[PDB]
Symmetry: C4
Subunit: 389 residues, 4 copies
């Protein structure tokens, strides 16, 4: 029996905290992995926290130069949601410096991309055993969501990318069944750019809000049917949710094209709620600091910038970073819909801080039927560490 | 099938030790969380120790200022009863600086109150996944039992509080089913004050002995039916079981009103045994040191101060603190009644001791059919630690 | 369905190693409990290593004075056989400075004796939840096997002791069912002395080889029927298996009375093999060093000193100490008999060595159908530790 | 129901990474065992990493002289594939300084050889409980595969060795059922030498590529039927896959006899793919550095040196060492054949490096239907450690 995941995304008014691991504060004395790009995904029985290790530990010399993105030592592991990425509760998942993982109702599927930049291999694991393989088709840093992939009625959908990080690249959709690749598709997006999508299920379709690392300060949107016909564009809303981005005033908005002129970016998410959208963004406009989520009326389909709800999760005095989407299985929450949840990565260390290392901890939040008071569930580590001294 | 928990509380003559974790002594070298407010609760298969972490570890710099009550880093976690609140056996439960948790026969329900003082949110988890939410109704430190909530025939009952910690506040009863809030009630207690109740089941009803942080050195009592009609008052017995409290002589006793004149307090418990009561208190009258339990004949219904049984668990040379109630499931003990058990928190560090940190360890005791010799299962940590030096 | 344990003890020719935990060597850097009196017991699914913690860890200051026998901090915990008594794989069992534990086919029963010397309480746990209680009947250090208790057809049999450690004391037999005490018996042994028995099943009866801490250098033997009628005596064999003991020549032997004249002792074991006996002893005659096991033809029923088999397990350059018996469930080994197994405790530290601490590690051995070459599976820790310096 | 393992070995074009534990890098701060000879084996539910501990930990003084091969403290333990050989996730397996382990569909069988050189005992464990025993038949370091043994239709086959490490020795085949030895055989190989075979299933037969520590730089091959009739020889291919070995040009090749003239060696593997062979070897010809795998057309049956595929896994600037074979159960991968997988041991420390210790980490790779880009999933530890200083 599969976890069908066919329902509609609930309409939520606000977000309550799910979890907070204190990974970095604990790692000051604890045996915690140095890691980046954590994310959450759930099965009918548990929600887990996936992460990319730097094959080393906080407060140790091997944490030096952990600002580096890709390395032979980086592995995908997992723990229970809320737990710290410690050694002693960690499940090995895949060798990976870019990843995605998700459950199909019967078993975990995980994809781990590793290898050399010009010829990376993506190892598909299902049930903790390699089953398939995707080679780099364009020869330039084959990568993936860095968040939950999406499983609907037994098939699992995710988005990859190959090509420049600064100009046109190439993006595809992959679909597997019990670890086996049964489908793929090229996305036609000229003038567009899609990195590190954050996807979820919604009316039996894969909705994804991605990252434009080329020119858009608006987020590319993508809605994938099971037959791998797609709808690609930008988040209509007249509010920019990438970082770096311009003010909210000097911004227009487009359903179709990238707007903004600044390049760069950060991974992020958004949930549709009919015509509206809960969109995620850092508080700072130019730095990875602070985190809030906004509800834009009609923002999914219009260039609207009408805010009816807003909630701060990390204050702008505290570092954040990545954020992504996932959903609670109907088998878990009991609802008749899919409870939208998100996580925020909270980067500490280099390049912003006084360390030889870079790492991050996380907070997870879940959609509820009420408005939630603003606050800051901040990281709370005191830098530098002993290793930095 | 639910864990019905409908029986009568056994009549016990004394208490034998269940467990002792040595959390602080182990934390001198081990990787143990800095924590406060631990408590125990059981399922048909295990008893667990819940606790509030300070998002950091003993002997580490992040343990500084751990005397603080509320923080963004405080989380509810759990281990097996008797185990130390270590990192490597810990289950993440909820983000919380005030909490309660209990099992319904099918799954753990946990409530974790966190957020800002003036608008705290209580996240209801059931089965390790947020399901409901209670916002602060009175805008002043929404809080809860800091001990086991109570489940009877599938519904789970607990008591919250919002308002001043020094004068009249507001208290409610909440009732949920599989994580969903299906009921609540306002408690009318003018001139009264209810903090951190310690509840248990007894003839299909929730019996609670609470804390008066306003003026009573006697403990408010509360007996909750499943329909959320209640009976609120004070522990009749002519003996005061709060701290600070006066002598046993210069005290009268009331079934109805607060007596004593000193304010302040500490969380504590009591079990009814017909008309009598096993009541819990620190040995010192003005400090959180020592621990004994007393059996007052007719003490539940009279202002009696007749002691038939007495048992010292912590001597008055050693620190203690909180104490609370729980019960063994009939599915566990095999009895035809509910075995009354309690735990004592043993606070070490600030404000009483020579540290930058505050933490605590625990001992658990269970009702048996015999008298048990007095002794001191004391904490045993040697302060200050390396971090303090 | 129960684990009937009704078979005969196999006849084995030699012993192969089961396990070795390296607990102390690992504890030089690892987070290992300071412990004493470890022992093994098995269920139809696993064999576990029980031990008494000193509520502290190796290489830590709280390990000071760990030579002390009884303390409020000493707890019974357990791990998998062969694992180290580490914090992070440990199951809490009971508060105990003297203990026994055993499985009935359905659940673990454990007994943990703690409290004050003159009024100790023994807390009976079954399935990790206190169920019964035995108070000190003679008021002088109520204690027990310090090794596996014995379960036959659902009932569990063990031996306790109360009274002097140097003269006549009092010893009883206890029998429980699912944690409940259903029987007990006084053992009439005037001029005799029984400490820390090492028992096993054999033709549906409990065979025990104990310790005489009064005057015998021979080991008291005891064979318990399920109705609690017993046969008490001494190990007939003309060879002394206690420490301190005299030479093998200047010794006679008795089936009935204590021989030897030296007092003191150490816990030890023996298996019957028809009329013969595998008997366990240290190599040294006056110190707790070295370990070998001997097969005495007709030694169970005669004062024989005829050795047909012999096997050294610890050489006399290396420390040992306690040793005890247990059996593999027929459900585990597959045999049509009960495979005799033993463990040796290897004490390190005080009083023999240059430390502030005392601890021990273990080796487990199991009866096989062949002779096994002599060797020394010694402890291997390098003393003193960092803490000692 | 058994795991029949009767299928054919898949024909694979290349190898994708399964796992990488970073055991040594983590052990710079983590609590990781000092170990050697790790290997992988799988059940219908998980793949585990077996290893031989040195009964001590990295960065600790007890890691001194860990270059030693055999010791009383060396034990076989296991973790999940990809996990680090840490203390806190380790399963005790057997006391062993030479080992093999494998699953029969119902339970793990493990063999652990320990004891004195001249009379070693091999303890057979099945289901984590000793069941059988093999004594040294030739009196000179009884040893075994140091990799997965092989189970076909409920019976488990493996190869042992007794005798000189430099000249003729003696080798046997053992076959067991649920831990019980039901068969054995002498291998007639005069002028030959077989150490540390690496075996796998293939058409219901045990195929093994071994190590010649006498004179061959080619690897002895062995194909074992269930009736214990065998076919013994050398890997036909005209390419030498041992280390030390000569150039590929000044080498001939033999299906039958040892070629090469240099002695010494290292454990290694090979898979048949019809008439071809995937053969494993270090990159260096004289040192244990680098690792690649080659596909020789017709290499299994001819003295061919025709390479159609090649893949570098460890570069020749980085240390490697042992490598061995295993297979994914059909119950795991879903294929209609047995997916060939291998692991490479990556030795660090003595004799090559600036330490008092020797240890190693690992990488696991699995056969896929495509060519995989060359790279170096190297160890990555920075030597010397703190302990070395
Ligand atoms: C534009 C996003 C991708 C494209 C190469 O780069 C990721 C950017 C990034 C960041 O902090 O902004 C972190 C990621 N690092 C890892 N996944 N290890 C970058 N991704 C990769 C694959 O290098
Ligand atoms: C009067 C009891 C409550 C009311 C605010 O305060 C708790 C007092 C307390 C103590 O040691 O006395 C500890 C609690 N700390 C935490 N739960 N973190 C106080 N409770 C809160 C919610 O701050
Ligand atoms: C004569 C055996 C008993 C009788 C009091 O003493 C035990 C002796 C002992 C030893 O090393 O010889 C260790 C035990 N320590 C603990 N069990 N903690 C002694 N037993 C007790 C209960 O103190
Ligand atoms: C020739 C292979 C065997 C024969 C005695 O020796 C093993 C060589 C070896 C190495 O690094 O080359 C390591 C092994 N060590 C352990 N298994 N502990 C050697 N094997 C034994 C049993 O000593
Ligand atoms: Ca951008
Ligand atoms: Ca008060
Ligand atoms: Ca004696
Ligand atoms: Ca060779």
């Amino acid at each position: 029996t599969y976890m069908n995941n066919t329902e509609a995304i609930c309409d939520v008014k606000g977000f309550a905290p799910f979890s907070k691991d204190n990974g970095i504060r604990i790692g000051s004395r604890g045996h915690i992995f140095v890691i980046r790009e954590p994310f959450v995904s759930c099965s009918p029985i548990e929600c887990r926290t996936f992460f990319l290790t730097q094959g080393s530990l906080l407060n140790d010399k091997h944490s030096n130069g952990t600002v580096k993105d890709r390395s032979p030592f980086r592995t995908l592991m997992s723990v229970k949601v809320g737990q710290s990425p410690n050694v002693y509760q960690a499940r090995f998942e895949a060798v990976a410096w870019s990843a995605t993982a998700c459950h199909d109702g019967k078993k975990w599927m995980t994809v781990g991309v590793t290898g050399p930049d010009s010829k990376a291999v993506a190892v598909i694991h299902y049930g903790g055993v390699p089953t398939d393989v995707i080679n780099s088709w364009a020869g330039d840093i084959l990568r993936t969501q860095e968040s939950s992939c999406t499983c609907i009625q037994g098939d699992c959908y995710w988005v990859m990318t190959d090509g420049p990080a600064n100009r046109q690249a190439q993006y595809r959709i992959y679909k597997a069944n019990q670890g086996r690749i049964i489908g793929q598709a090229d996305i036609s997006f000229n003038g567009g750019h899609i990195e590190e999508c954050s996807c979820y299920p919604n009316d039996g379709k894969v909705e994804c809000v991605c990252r434009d690392n080329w020119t858009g300060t608006n987020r590319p949107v993508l809605v994938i049917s099971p037959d791998l016909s797609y709808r690609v564009g930008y988040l209509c809303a007249g509010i920019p949710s990438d970082t770096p981005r311009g003010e909210d005033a000097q911004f227009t908005g487009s359903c179709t094209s990238p707007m903004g002129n600044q390049g760069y970016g950060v991974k992020g998410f958004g949930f549709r709620q009919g015509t509206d959208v809960w969109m995620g963004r850092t508080i700072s406009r130019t730095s990875r600091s602070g985190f809030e989520i906004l509800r834009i009326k009609n923002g999914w389909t219009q260039t609207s910038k009408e805010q009816v709800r807003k909630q701060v999760v990390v204050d702008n005095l505290n570092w954040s970073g990545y954020s992504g989407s996932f959903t609670l299985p109907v088998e878990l929450s009991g609802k008749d819909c899919l409870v939208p949840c998100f996580w925020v990565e909270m980067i500490r260390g280099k390049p912003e801080e006084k360390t030889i290392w870079t790492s991050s901890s996380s907070i997870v939040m879940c959609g509820v039927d009420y408005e939630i008071a603003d606050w800051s569930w901040h990281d709370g580590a005191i830098l530098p560490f002993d290793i930095d001294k």
